Amino acid sequence: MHILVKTLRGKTITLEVEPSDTIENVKAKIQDKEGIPPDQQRLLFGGNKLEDGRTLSDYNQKESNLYLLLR
Amino acid sequence: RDFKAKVQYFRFWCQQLAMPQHIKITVTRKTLFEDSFQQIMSFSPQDLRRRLWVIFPGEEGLDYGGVAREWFFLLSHEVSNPMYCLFEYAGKCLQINPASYINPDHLKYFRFIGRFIAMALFHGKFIDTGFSLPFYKRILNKPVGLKDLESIDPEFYNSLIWVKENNIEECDLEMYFSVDKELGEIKSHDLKPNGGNILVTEENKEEYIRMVAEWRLSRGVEEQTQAFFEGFNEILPQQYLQYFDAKELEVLLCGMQEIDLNDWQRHAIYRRYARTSKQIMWFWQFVKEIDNEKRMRLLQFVTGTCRLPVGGFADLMGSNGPQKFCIEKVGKENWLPRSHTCFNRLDLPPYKSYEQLKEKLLFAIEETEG
């Protein structure tokens, strides 16, 4: 499922990921396109923060917006 | 306050600025948008303040008396058509399309849409089209912020609410008062002077959340908005609408509509609540008690608009496609009720009595959330 990875600056990053992929695996996939260490990354879906290890199907779909906050 | 008193006052002000005699407006149904554009622009603002004698030559079912109500109704539908490249719309609200530059004369057309909307207010004719809650605040020269971003972009709003409610200094997050701007390549754009080298902290996180929300709600429609208000203010000056709010101005433009309580309850979903829940039954007793004037304000408070589709509450639309009216169980009796216009969801707390619900909801739809 092709989902969008956005920031509060206005940047966007379309990354292809399966529903079984985790937040630690999603942050590791962002390193191949953006080049940021996964420890400095802080993703969030909805109003809640995404915890590294849990699968993407728990937070829940195609063409979604995940906001990335750098550390 | 009383909206009937405010509308009656505004109608008196227009009657004083009105001009004598009338003007001819000739249009056709086939090329209505372009005919109307050529016609409205051929006249001066003082001529557009005279009586609008509109005609649809060669249209059975209309006569050579006044036909302005059918013109204002039909033309408002064609304004939303995406082929003109001015507004982006949902199939079957008006959001200015940032790619309107495609139409080389788009700013000339936005001035005409400015005159059209100011002419509907002045002449007391209703339109069957409406802008977003923040856009009505733009017309009223009221400040825009994070609250209004939820309607246009809910996930950006949700990311900003996390920054507001969580500790950025403990989490150690790199954020500056600057945003991306493109046309070739991309460059930084400061929100405040020297914003790019000003780290967002706990002291100024509220200022940052405001300035980003304000930017996001007008990032690529500045010239278009500026062109719209050139046309608006030359017919009706914005100063005449200062005593109205974004919900009153919508009803002043779109007119009053009788809401069907049966179609409302039949096509209403419930989150963590049942149809037989004490609070859900008190809510429909409240809707039945209040006058249509307050039912429209309750509908506006939950969905973001008094307008409804020709189909009904079954064809109700949200931000992510079709979403029916929802009532969610959230909080405790101490809380005030909240809403999510993107999903038409009402966050109703579990109150202990009907009078508490009647006092809390009636106050929340009048005084709004802050």
Curated annotation (Swiss-Prot), chain A:
Q: Where is this chain's protein located in or outside the cell? A: Cytoplasm; Nucleus; Mitochondrion outer membrane
Impact upon substituting residue 62 to R: Abolishes HLTF-mediated polyubiquitination of PCNA
Membrane topology type? Peripheral membrane protein
Q: Where is this site: Interacts with activating enzyme?
A: 54, 71
**Renumbered to this chain, where is the cross-link Glycyl lysine isopeptide (Lys-Gly) (interchain with G-Cter in ubiquitin)?**
6, 11, 27, 29, 33, 62
Positions of post-translational Phosphoserine modification: 64
Annotated effect of mutating residue 71 to K: No effect on ADP-ribosylation
According to the record, mutating residue 64 to D results in: Phosphomimetic mutant that binds and activates PRKN
Q: Which residues carry this modification: (Microbial infection) ADP-ribosylthreonine?
A: 65
Q: What is the effect of changing residue 64 to E?
A: Phosphomimetic mutant that binds and activates PRKN
PTM annotation? Phosphorylated at Ser-64 by PINK1 during mitophagy. Phosphorylated ubiquitin specifically binds and activates parkin (PRKN), triggering mitophagy. Phosphorylation does not affect E1-mediated E2 charging of ubiquitin but affects discharging of E2 enzymes to form polyubiquitin chains. It also affects deubiquitination by deubiquitinase enzymes such as USP30. Mono-ADP-ribosylated at the C-terminus by PARP9, a component of the PPAR9-DTX3L complex. ADP-ribosylation requires processing by E1 and E2 enzymes and prevents ubiquitin conjugation to substrates such as histones.
Q: What does this protein do?
A: Exists either covalently attached to another protein, or free (unanchored). When covalently bound, it is conjugated to target proteins via an isopeptide bond either as a monomer (monoubiquitin), a polymer linked via different Lys residues of the ubiquitin (polyubiquitin chains) or a linear polymer linked via the initiator Met of the ubiquitin (linear polyubiquitin chains).
- The name under which this protein is listed is Ubiquitin
Protein's organism: Homo sapiens
Q: What is the lineage of its organism?
A: Eukaryota, Metazoa, Chordata, Craniata, Vertebrata
Query: Which gene is transcribed and translated to give this protein?
Result: UBC
**Full-sequence range covered:** 1 to 72 of 685
UniProtKB/Swiss-Prot annotation, chain B:
Q: How is it modified after translation?
A: On T-cell activation, phosphorylation by the JNK cascade on serine and threonine residues surrounding the PRR domain accelerates the ubiquitination and degradation of JUN and JUNB. The increased ITCH catalytic activity due to phosphorylation by JNK1 may occur due to a conformational change disrupting the interaction between the PRR/WW motifs domain and the HECT domain and, thus exposing the HECT domain. Phosphorylation by FYN reduces interaction with JUNB and negatively controls JUN ubiquitination and degradation. Monoubiquitinated. Autopolyubiquitinated with 'Lys-63' linkages which does not lead to protein degradation.
Ranges of residues in domain HECT: 44-370
Annotated signal sequence is none
| Residues the record marks as active site | 342 (glycyl thioester intermediate)
Q: Where is this region: MAP kinase docking site?
A: 49-58
Quick one: effect of changing residue 342 to A?
Loss of ubiquitin protein ligase activity. Results in altered endosomal sorting and reduced degradation of CXCR4. Unable to inhibit MAVS-induced activation of INFB
Q: In which tissues is it expressed?
A: Widely expressed.
Location in the cell reads: Cell membrane; Cytoplasm; Nucleus; Early endosome membrane
Disease affiliated with this protein:
Autoimmune disease, multisystem, with facial dysmorphism: A disorder characterized by organomegaly, failure to thrive, developmental delay, dysmorphic features and autoimmune inflammatory cell infiltration of the lungs, liver and gut.
Assembly and partners are described as: Monomer. Part of a ternary complex composed of SMAD3, ITCH/AIP4 and NEDD9/HEF1; within the complex NEDD9/HEF1 interacts (via N-terminus) with ITCH/AIP4 (via WW domains); the complex mediates ubiquitination and proteasomal degradation of NEDD9/HEF1. Interacts (via WW domains) with OCNL. Interacts (via WW domains) with NOTCH1. Interacts (via WW domains) with JUN. Interacts with JUNB; the interaction promotes ITCH-mediated ubiquitination and degradation of JUNB. (Microbial infection) Interacts with Epstein-Barr virus LMP2A.
Q: State its role.
A: Acts as an Acts as an E3 ubiquitin-protein ligase which accepts ubiquitin from an E2 ubiquitin-conjugating enzyme in the form of a thioester and then directly transfers the ubiquitin to targeted substrates. Catalyzes 'Lys-29'-, 'Lys-48'- and 'Lys-63'-linked ubiquitin conjugation. Involved in the control of inflammatory signaling pathways. Essential component of a ubiquitin-editing protein complex, comprising also TNFAIP3, TAX1BP1 and RNF11, that ensures the transient nature of inflammatory signaling pathways. Promotes the association of the complex after TNF stimulation.
Comment on protein domains? The WW domains mediate interaction with PPxY motif-containing proteins.
What is the recorded name of this protein? E3 ubiquitin-protein ligase Itchy homolog
